[PDB]
Amino acid sequence: TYTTGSFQLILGLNAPQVISGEGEPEGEVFASLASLEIKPEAHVQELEIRLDKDTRYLTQHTRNLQPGDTFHALVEPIGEAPLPRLRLTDSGGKPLAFGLIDQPGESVELNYTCDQDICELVVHVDGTDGQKDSGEAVYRLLVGINAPNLRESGQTPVGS
Amino acid sequence: RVQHFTGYIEDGRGIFYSLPDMKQGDIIYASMQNTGGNLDPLVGIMAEEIDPAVSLGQVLEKALASENDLISELTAVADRIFLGWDDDGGKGYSASLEFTIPRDGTYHIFAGSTITNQRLDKFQP
DSSP: OOOOOOOOOOOOSSOGGGGGTOOOOOSOOOOOOSGGGSOOOOEEEEEEEEEOSSOOEEEEEOOOBOTTOEEEEEEEESSSOOOOEEEEEETTOOEEEEOEEOSSOSOEEEEEEOOSSSBOEEEEEEOOSSSOOOOOEEEEEEEEESOTTGGGOOSOOOOO | OOOOOOOOOOSSOOEEEEEEEEOTTOEEEEEEOOOSTTOOEEEEEESSOOOTHHHHHHHHHHHTTSOOOHHHHHHHHHHHHOSEEESSOSSTTOEEEEEEOOSSEEEEEEEEEOOOOOOSSSOOO
């Protein structure tokens, strides 16, 4: 089988002490990450959620985001269910973004960009506008990382 | 030129500090860190001393009743009340501010609490 885990890599140029495994950084750099030369890989996931009478508030946790990344989300009801509210907060609850209703008012969308070294995000979906017992309202939630084309994804959910 | 201050904030009641007779061309620096409790620092600078409580209260009045998007309404009110401000520019929720003194005169520094949510079961600023 294959193996998984974290690693430390030390590279040297005309520095015979590297093969000992104890080479301290010195001189001027000579190698760089190759993946930075091209475009990032998109990850998309879609889930179906239902807001019952006693379960009108729902939250979900997202994986860690590296600096420079982007985050998008949108919600579309299955049928005649009213549009719920959408917002984005961190793990402590500090607000970061709020949902915008499009001119064709059938969906709500959100967007964010990463600034800190590590960002942990939480997505809030709530339909507790009042106290009406609408019943079995069901919505479709689409989320993506580094996927600005979530409006027309086309491909099935890719990546992790 | 560095000076230290320590204080306590109760239910969003800020503290004013006076900067007498600054000169044009000076650069002000500010940093505010939490040392106890759940305080979320906020710092702002202005010329004429006016209590922001009446203006900031309307932001809590609107959010408490609707969607209103706090992060929008707070930025718009702050850009009117203060000449310069910062919420989370430091390590964590701490604030840090750089402000070039526009003209010659005196100014005021305002320290206090921002409007935030700290729950995941329901939204309550």
